[PDB]
Amino acid sequence: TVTYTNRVADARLGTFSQLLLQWKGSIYKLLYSEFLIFISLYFAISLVYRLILSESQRLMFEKLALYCNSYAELIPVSFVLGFYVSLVVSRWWAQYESIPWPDRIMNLVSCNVDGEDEYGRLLRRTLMRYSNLCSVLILRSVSTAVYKRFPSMEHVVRAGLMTPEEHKKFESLNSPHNKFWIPCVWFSNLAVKARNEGRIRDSVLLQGILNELNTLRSQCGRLYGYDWISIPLVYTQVVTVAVYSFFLACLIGRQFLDPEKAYPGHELDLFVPVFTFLQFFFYAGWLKVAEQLINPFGEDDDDFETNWLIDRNLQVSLMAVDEMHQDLPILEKDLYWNE
Amino acid sequence: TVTYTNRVADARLGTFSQLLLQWKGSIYKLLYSEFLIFISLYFAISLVYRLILSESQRLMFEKLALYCNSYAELIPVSFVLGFYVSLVVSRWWAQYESIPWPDRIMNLVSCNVDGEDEYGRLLRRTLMRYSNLCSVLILRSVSTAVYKRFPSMEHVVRAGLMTPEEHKKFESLNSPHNKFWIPCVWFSNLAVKARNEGRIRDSVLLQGILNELNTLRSQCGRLYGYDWISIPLVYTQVVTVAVYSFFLACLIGRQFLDPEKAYPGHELDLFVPVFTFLQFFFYAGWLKVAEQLINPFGEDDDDFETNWLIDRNLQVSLMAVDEMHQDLPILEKDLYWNE
Amino acid sequence: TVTYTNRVADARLGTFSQLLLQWKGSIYKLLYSEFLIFISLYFAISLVYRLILSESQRLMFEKLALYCNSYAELIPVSFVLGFYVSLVVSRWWAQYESIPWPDRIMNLVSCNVDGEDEYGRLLRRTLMRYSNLCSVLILRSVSTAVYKRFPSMEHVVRAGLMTPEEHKKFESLNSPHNKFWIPCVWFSNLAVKARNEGRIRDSVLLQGILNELNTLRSQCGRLYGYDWISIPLVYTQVVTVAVYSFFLACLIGRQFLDPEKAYPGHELDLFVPVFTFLQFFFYAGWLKVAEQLINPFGEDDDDFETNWLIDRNLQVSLMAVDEMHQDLPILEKDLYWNE
Amino acid sequence: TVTYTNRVADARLGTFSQLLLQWKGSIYKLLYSEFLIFISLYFAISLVYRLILSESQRLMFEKLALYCNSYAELIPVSFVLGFYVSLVVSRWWAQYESIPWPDRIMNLVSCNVDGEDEYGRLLRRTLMRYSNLCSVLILRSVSTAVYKRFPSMEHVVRAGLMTPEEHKKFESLNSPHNKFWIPCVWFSNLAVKARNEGRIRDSVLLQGILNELNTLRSQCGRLYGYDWISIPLVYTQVVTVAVYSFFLACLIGRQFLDPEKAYPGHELDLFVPVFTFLQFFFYAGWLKVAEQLINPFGEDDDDFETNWLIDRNLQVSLMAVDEMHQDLPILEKDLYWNE
Amino acid sequence: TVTYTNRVADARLGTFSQLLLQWKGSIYKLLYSEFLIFISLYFAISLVYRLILSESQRLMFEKLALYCNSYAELIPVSFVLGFYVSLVVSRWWAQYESIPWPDRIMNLVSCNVDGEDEYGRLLRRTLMRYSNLCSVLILRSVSTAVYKRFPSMEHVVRAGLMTPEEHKKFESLNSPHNKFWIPCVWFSNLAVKARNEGRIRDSVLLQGILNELNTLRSQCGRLYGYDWISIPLVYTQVVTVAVYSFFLACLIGRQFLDPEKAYPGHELDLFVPVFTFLQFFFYAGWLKVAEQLINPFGEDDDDFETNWLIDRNLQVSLMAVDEMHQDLPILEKDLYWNE
Ligand SMILES: [Ca+2]
Ligand SMILES: [Ca+2]
Ligand SMILES: [Ca+2]
Ligand SMILES: [Ca+2]
Ligand SMILES: [Ca+2]
């Protein structure tokens, strides 16, 4: 993602005007190629009109230019872009909040699974590693950056997320579907084993741990559902046909005709339409918003930083249930102590 | 569904322009017949205008064409399509998230119902099969693809979802309503029987299993509610009358009149209106979005893959509570082991 | 409600065009009287213009018709109808999901309240009957169809929902407010009595039953809140003044003036404006959507079927906690049994 | 509030047309003064134009009227009113659902706190009175009607909501912030005291009572948050500058000019513009919707009835935990008793 | 924030018109510099047109002014501002409700952690101080005002939120990420230690305390997610290019041309366009709404008062779990006591 939230905290004079001079993740980086194609086509048509055509051909081209200028209409294009980009942004933020965080399971496994010896330490680390693996196996299915980081399951083993005996048990389980649900079953079986051996005290603490497991499972299921069910293809083809029809009308209708014939609206020849190019930046950039956000797990400048998030979740989890189990600072009186 | 999420991960040059060359689930496959009817009517009217009519008849037709061209208005049609398609897409995604998944019940039944002998194995398998049956009995009511897969209850028996004694008990229960709530009562009675025989340890684990049962029941109730309560019929008839009135105005008002009489706006005869046909693709495709998504359990190219989802849920459930009960990999130290 | 969800499963050629030939719940049944009033007023003004008026009076009427045709403006009317109908449809679907279903309480009372003798049977039936009564007492307050079914509390007694001793206890309780909260207190007291006599085993099962009771109470409170707090009256009067002002402009501005005087836009006399009548069907039907859905508990063709839903809930509840208490089919091996 | 939900149940002929003849809470009562100011300014300008000005002054005024009529533009005003009123109505209904209801705590305190003697009776009444006080102390902060009912804390004591020893303990607690959180701490301490004395049986029932306490605390926190964080002032000033700029353009541009000079669009002198006044009612009433609903706890005709709701909550709570503790009707067989 | 909710309770005559005379947080304070730049550029171009240019240059400037006036189009600018400001306001209110409040943890820690001696007092104070620290460490990451209050962790120590031994333990924990999750692990370990020493009675009360801890952790995670994932930069650059293109068209197209040449629409020379400046206030202020609300934790007049909220939360928490532990008013009969 491109974070600029510290830049737009106050509403000063140059609040949003300073954001037009940025390159990374901007509208220019997304519209360079389309703008150069549009410039090339426009000045090609204009120079063919000025230099090649004969006089009757010029008259027919002027009539065609008036015909095409009658259909350059902005309002329904603005409608369909507004509703489509609203749908895309709603699904974008809805996909962000489905990314699973291990912290709620971390707080309970760090405290409730007892044992300051080796075995309870190993038990807590294995539980949080099973929680992180259940998230990595769905992020490598919904994202291309995580999939380029983990192309095979052996790359998941190399990273330390899965011991080779867990990989042998993982491949021995025979299922033709996506296997992101395997560690979230291993977690619950290990938690019940830990209770039956005497590490978890009562049933209530075990059921709290299992409820947070099911919450993380529902998060992974939401990510799977957003990846598997896209925005419909016809509703994307409608907005592209609309925007490209508007720009095809503006390629011909927005020419500068001959002023000696005095057409209404064509009394001046400027050789370069500034406002047509600004309308191009407006409409084509407001389509590129929806092009960028339709899959936020890719590799754009403003797609989600998911590899960083995997690294954070693994380090924080194994830090909090190993180095922070019953390791508290000394209970002292605070500054607001009355008596 | 038609998945193209891997294709639109990055915002390259040909991001959405490559989606216009696709056929399966596209706008062309949904607009072929309407477009051919529109082409036939338009060129019929145009050739009758050019070849059959006399001169005074030609003058009356030109006056009628100016009258009909005065009413080809795009802005309220774009309004009503925008709001209606927003409603349809909101209900579409709301119906996806109501499809029940057995995984939250699966995690708890795989671990908490004890017994490595035959009886506890049979008990866990019967519990997850009662959870899957409560979902299949509502998917064969809300969907046409699941109903063509399971036309009678005997087809549900053949698939292994229901033993014949369960079918005899199912038909002995006399109720004139939809019976999708029967296995979700059998589940809770079998869970309480399993607790009273000594398989489930405490009351807390039993109540956690029953809470996940009630969550799956609420999912099935949401699917029943979305199928039974449609979008109102008058609010669909409004958008169809609007779009067909616009196209009836464009059949006559968008003719190419005789240029020798020099009507304002009709100075050139091109024999084929490109921009009228592009406006047809835009408006008729933005109506076909709402036609396709108004019942996402049918048999379109972008309706929900529900038979696959039933097969997945059954295989994953019976795999996780039978082959994975207290079958864990060997507890080893991970790569991040400090001491 | 008018269900057509099986008709619009696929996006065929005649998907929505077949819905224009339906009568029950359609736009025609809602716009018959307004359309006949509009036709009568329009042709009255037109025939007075053609037959009664003198020539200077004709000239003044033509000037008035041009003045009124200058104000027939469609875009803000389409704005205010779009936002108002969006609010109405949002509240409509929000009121559907607040209707209470007894099934979550049914699953727990069918299993956890023990006793295969007469007393436990009577206890379970009394609990589910107290759950259904707490829903009927709010549906007869928010709906007119349920109120015509149950005009007095004696009609609730006749239907079997309330024994006469419960009616005596119900009328002995002195409160000047709506008494839909009485059976939801009787439920919790009977559940605690059932626990203290030895029927409910532990505290956890009792608290699960009471939590589902409070969920059904929150559902009834939502229905009470949606009925008591309407859409504001000024926001309905705005959209009616807007639509009726547009149609008052179209009564006079859309006349066919005399072609011999050659007004711009009035060069042809057709005697019947097709597109004005189609704009009438569009705008008046898109107002009738909001007229129909503003109270979905009435007696329209697409209001909620609430009497059927009460009958279903009562039959399913008393069936599941009496005939299905510890009455399970024989535990057999399924078809996917491995060993 | 103005309830008309029983009036608009069916979609008859006079469904919404009968709502235009109502006065209480209507558009007329909110637009009387603005409409009279607009009428006075308009006819003042018109009579100064007709009677006072000389001929060259008349020519300059006609040029100014054409200039101002060129800027009376309706579409962006309709945009900004639509989005702003959508925000106001969304926050309005969101503030209704945050009003706390004591019924979920009432069901649990009526049943779980044991004791048919004096002490348990006093304990249950004190618990529900602490629940109601925690709601009254935030309704007298967010509302002006509740604040006029309870101007000081002594008026809260007079009403019986707070005994004078509770007022002494309430004022002894020294905090410079709003003290609506004090009775919601007293509730939890009294509940734990009641458990430790033997009135509440187990820990599970105590934790259920405390969870419903925290739910009511979150409701009060939502009301505090909606009152403290208003809609931004600049986003209200934008819509008022837009609507008043449109009406300032219509004061001068919508004059009836001299017909003898034959301006295009001013060929008739009617002395009173009907459609300009109807556009005034439309736009000014669609602003008065947002003016009325921006604080729904005031004293408009369609603000929330909060004093009634406080009276209801207090009477229902003290009725249900005192007169209805273990006072059940006699368990009889219902009408659907099979055997 | 700027609170005016007490001012707009009723819908009087001067309800919103009195808000146009306010300065703090208004549209004037946000548009002063842009308005002066626009005034300077406009009157510079106008005086260069009136005094410097020759006659043929005047003719070319009039042609250029007609060309630029043909592109001053308001409707798509109003579209894109409406949808963008709707997104900004939705995220604004969504970020308000993610601010964590300690009151739900406060109610349970004040009652369930036993001990009226020194040790239980210190235990309850340390628990609520760990809850407040977990909120301060994320507010100093998402806000600039809290970060200017707490620039280093030593400033957090000075304020009494963290004792120096807790700071030594906090810096000994080695993690390269944001450490706002450390006190929410210390809380759960101290709660389990308090249960194992005999202060918390059962497992159910401990699990309720831990569930409210996880709820506050999810609140802090939501604030972190809204700060880290901004609105996309291209979707802000689109709306700024649109608004600045409209104002660049209005700088030249809205000039007052020479009336002696009698251009259509330029028949009068007023020297100052009132309606162009009002359209500037409308569009530029409706952009400044989105400029102000895009980061509501900054230092605008209508950003969130977060330092006050931190002070309130700390004082209320340490007041309620120290001075209010088992300190109840005397149980007296209320005014509604029957017998
Ligand atoms: Ca992307
Ligand atoms: Ca379909
Ligand atoms: Ca109705
Ligand atoms: Ca108000
Ligand atoms: Ca700000």
Cβ neighbours of residue D207 under 8 Å, at least 6 residues apart? Answer: E204, E205, E208
- For chain D, how many residues are written? 339
**Are D126 and E288 a contacting pair at CB < 8 A?**
no
**Chain breaks of chain B after residues with C–N above 2.5 Å:** none
- Cα angle A293, A297, A300 (rounded to 5 degrees) comes to 60
Q: Which residues surround ligand 2, an ion (CB under 5 A)?
A: B 292, 295, 298, 300, 303
Biggest CA-to-CA distance, chain E:
102
| Distance separating alpha carbons of residues B210 and B191, to the nearest angstrom | 8
Rounded (10°) CA dihedral D73, D74, D79, D80 = 70
Contact (Cβ atoms closer than 8 angstroms) between residue D77 and residue D283? yes
Short-list B88, B98, B135, B96, CA closest to B230:
B88
Contact (Cβ atoms closer than 8 angstroms) between residue C63 and residue C183? no
- Cα angle B177, B178, B184 (rounded to 5 degrees) comes to 120
Cβ neighbours of residue D223 under 8 Å, at least 6 residues apart? Answer: D95, D98, D99, D100, D138, D139, D142
Contact (Cβ atoms closer than 8 angstroms) between residue C47 and residue C271? no
| Distance separating alpha carbons of residues D164 and D158, to the nearest angstrom | 9
* Contact B127/C at CB under 8 A: no
Cβ neighbours of residue D111 under 8 Å, at least 6 residues apart? Answer: C185, C188, C189, C191, C192, C210, D325
- Cα angle C108, C111, C112 (rounded to 5 degrees) comes to 75
Short-list B128, B134, B325, B163, CA closest to B224:
B134
| Cβ neighbourhood burial of C51 (10 Å; 0-12, 13-18, 19+) | exposed
| Distance separating alpha carbons of residues D80 and D60, to the nearest angstrom | 33
Distance from CA of B31 to the nearest CA of C (A): 8
Chains with at least 3 CB pairs less than 8 angstroms from chain D:
C, E
Contact (Cβ atoms closer than 8 angstroms) between residue D278 and residue C241? yes
- Cα angle C277, C280, C284 (rounded to 5 degrees) comes to 155
**Are E5 and D230 a contacting pair at CB < 8 A?**
yes
Rounded (10°) CA dihedral E64, E69, E72, E75 = -150
Task: Provide the CA B259 distance to its chain's centre, in angstroms.
Answer: 50
Short-list B63, B49, B5, B46, CA closest to B276:
B46
E strand or H helix at A146, and its extent?
A: helix A145-149
In this structure, the number of other CB atoms found within 10 A of the CB of residue A172 comes to 10
Which residues in chain E (16-35) have CB-CB distances under 8 A to chain A?
30, 33-34
In this structure, the number of other CB atoms found within 10 A of the CB of residue A336 comes to 14
Contact (Cβ atoms closer than 8 angstroms) between residue B1 and residue B303? yes
Ligand 3: centre distance to CA C293 (Å): 5
E strand or H helix at B286, and its extent?
A: helix B274-293
Amino acid at C31: L
Ligand 3: centre distance to CA A19 (Å): 50
Contact (Cβ atoms closer than 8 angstroms) between residue D237 and residue E27? yes
Contact (Cβ atoms closer than 8 angstroms) between residue C221 and residue D312? no
Contact (Cβ atoms closer than 8 angstroms) between residue A177 and residue B314? no
* Contact E160/A at CB under 8 A: yes
Cβ neighbours of residue C294 under 8 Å, at least 6 residues apart? Answer: C88, C230, C231, C236, D5, D8
Q: C34-46 as b/e, with b when 16 or more CB fall inside 10 Å?
A: bbeebeeebeebb
* Secondary structure (3-state) at B193: helix
| Distance separating alpha carbons of residues D236 and B284, to the nearest angstrom | 38
Which chain B residues are Cβ-neighbours of A229 within 8 angstroms? 1, 93, 96, 304
- How many CA within 13 A on the CB side of residue B126? 25
* Secondary structure (3-state) at C281: helix
Contact (Cβ atoms closer than 8 angstroms) between residue D288 and residue E14? no
In this structure, the number of other CB atoms found within 10 A of the CB of residue C53 comes to 13
| Distance separating alpha carbons of residues D129 and D314, to the nearest angstrom | 8
Q: Which of E17, E86, E334 sits opposite D125 (nearest CB)?
A: E334
Distance from CA of E180 to the nearest CA of D (A): 24
Which chain D residues are Cβ-neighbours of C294 within 8 angstroms? 5, 8
Rg over CA atoms, chain A: 30
Q: Which residue of C has its CA nearest to D325?
A: C189
Amino acid at B171: E
Taking each helix axis as running N to C, give the angle between helix D75-96 and helix D233-253, from 0 to 180 degrees, rounded to the nearest 10: 140
Rg over CA atoms, chain D: 30
| Distance separating alpha carbons of residues A314 and A311, to the nearest angstrom | 5
E strand or H helix at A318, and its extent?
A: helix A306-320
**Are D249 and E275 a contacting pair at CB < 8 A?**
yes
Short-list C319, C324, C309, CA closest to C129:
C319
For residue E137 the two structure tokens come to: 């460490």
Biggest CA-to-CA distance, chain C:
102
- Name residue, tokens 């179209």: C250
For residue C220 the two structure tokens come to: 């009834």
Ligand 2: centre distance to CA A228 (Å): 17
In this structure, the number of other CB atoms found within 10 A of the CB of residue A65 comes to 21
| Distance separating alpha carbons of residues A171 and A329, to the nearest angstrom | 44
**Are C207 and D208 a contacting pair at CB < 8 A?**
yes
**Are B104 and A292 a contacting pair at CB < 8 A?**
no
Distance linking the first and last C-alpha atoms of chain D: 51
Q: Which of D203, D214, D298 sits opposite E104 (nearest CB)?
A: D214
Q: Which of C185, C228, C318 sits opposite D336 (nearest CB)?
A: C318
* Contact C261/D at CB under 8 A: no
* Contact B163/C at CB under 8 A: yes
* Secondary structure (3-state) at C290: helix
Which residues in chain D (307-326) have CB-CB distances under 8 A to chain C?
312, 315-316, 319-320, 323-326
Cβ neighbours of residue D14 under 8 Å, at least 6 residues apart? Answer: none
Q: What is the 3-state secondary structure (H, E, C) of chain D?
A: CCCCCCCCCCCCCCCCHHHHHCCCCCHHHHHHHHHHHHHHHHHHHHHHHHHHCCHHHHHHHHHHHHHHHCCCCCHHHHHHHHHHHHHHHHHHHHHHCCCCCCHHHHHHHHHHCCCCCHHHHHHHHHHHHHHHHHHHHHHHHHCCHHHHHCCCHHHHHHCCCCCHHHHHHHHHCCCCCCCCCCHHHHHHHHHHHHHHCCCCCCHHHHHHHHHHHHHHHHHHHHHHHHHHCCCCHHHHHHHHHHHHHHHHHHHHHCCCCCHHHCCCCCCCCCCCCHHHHHHHHHHHHHHHHHHHHCCCCCCCCCCCCHHHHHHHHHHHHHHHCCCCCCCCCCCCCCCCCCC
**Are B282 and A238 a contacting pair at CB < 8 A?**
yes
How many contacts, defined by CB atoms under 8 Å, are there between A and B?
Answer: 231
Contact (Cβ atoms closer than 8 angstroms) between residue C316 and residue C309? no
| Distance separating alpha carbons of residues C65 and C69, to the nearest angstrom | 6
Contact (Cβ atoms closer than 8 angstroms) between residue C209 and residue C189? no
Distance from CA of E190 to the nearest CA of A (A): 8
For residue A102 the two structure tokens come to: 């291990």
DSSP per position, A228-250: HSPPPHHHHHHHHHHHHHHHHHH
Taking each helix axis as running N to C, give the angle between helix C203-228 and helix C118-142, from 0 to 180 degrees, rounded to the nearest 10: 20
Short-list A192, A186, A214, A98, CA closest to B104:
A214
| Distance separating alpha carbons of residues A265 and D29, to the nearest angstrom | 49
- Cα angle D31, D33, D35 (rounded to 5 degrees) comes to 65
Contact (Cβ atoms closer than 8 angstroms) between residue B156 and residue B150? yes
* Contact C109/D at CB under 8 A: no
Q: Which of C75, C192, C213 sits opposite D112 (nearest CB)?
A: C192
Rounded (10°) CA dihedral A249, A253, A254, A255 = 130
* Secondary structure (3-state) at E47: helix
Backbone angle region of B82, left / alpha / beta, with phi > 0 → left and psi within -120 to 50 → alpha:
alpha
Contact (Cβ atoms closer than 8 angstroms) between residue A302 and residue A89? no
| Cβ neighbourhood burial of D320 (10 Å; 0-12, 13-18, 19+) | buried
Ligand whose nearest atom lies closest to the CA of D298: 4
Which chain E residues are Cβ-neighbours of A104 within 8 angstroms? 214, 217-218
Ligand whose nearest atom lies closest to the CA of E234: 1
How many angstroms is the resolution? 3.0
Cβ neighbours of residue C151 under 8 Å, at least 6 residues apart? Answer: none
Chains with at least 3 CB pairs less than 8 angstroms from chain C:
B, D
Q: What share of chain C is helix, strand, coil (3-state, %, to 5)?
A: 65, 0, 35
Ligand 5: centre distance to CA E230 (Å): 13
Chains with at least 3 CB pairs less than 8 angstroms from chain E:
A, D
Contact (Cβ atoms closer than 8 angstroms) between residue B253 and residue B72? yes
Short-list B185, B251, A268, CA closest to C327:
B185
Contact (Cβ atoms closer than 8 angstroms) between residue C89 and residue B94? no
Ligand 5: centre distance to CA D83 (Å): 21
* Contact D168/C at CB under 8 A: no
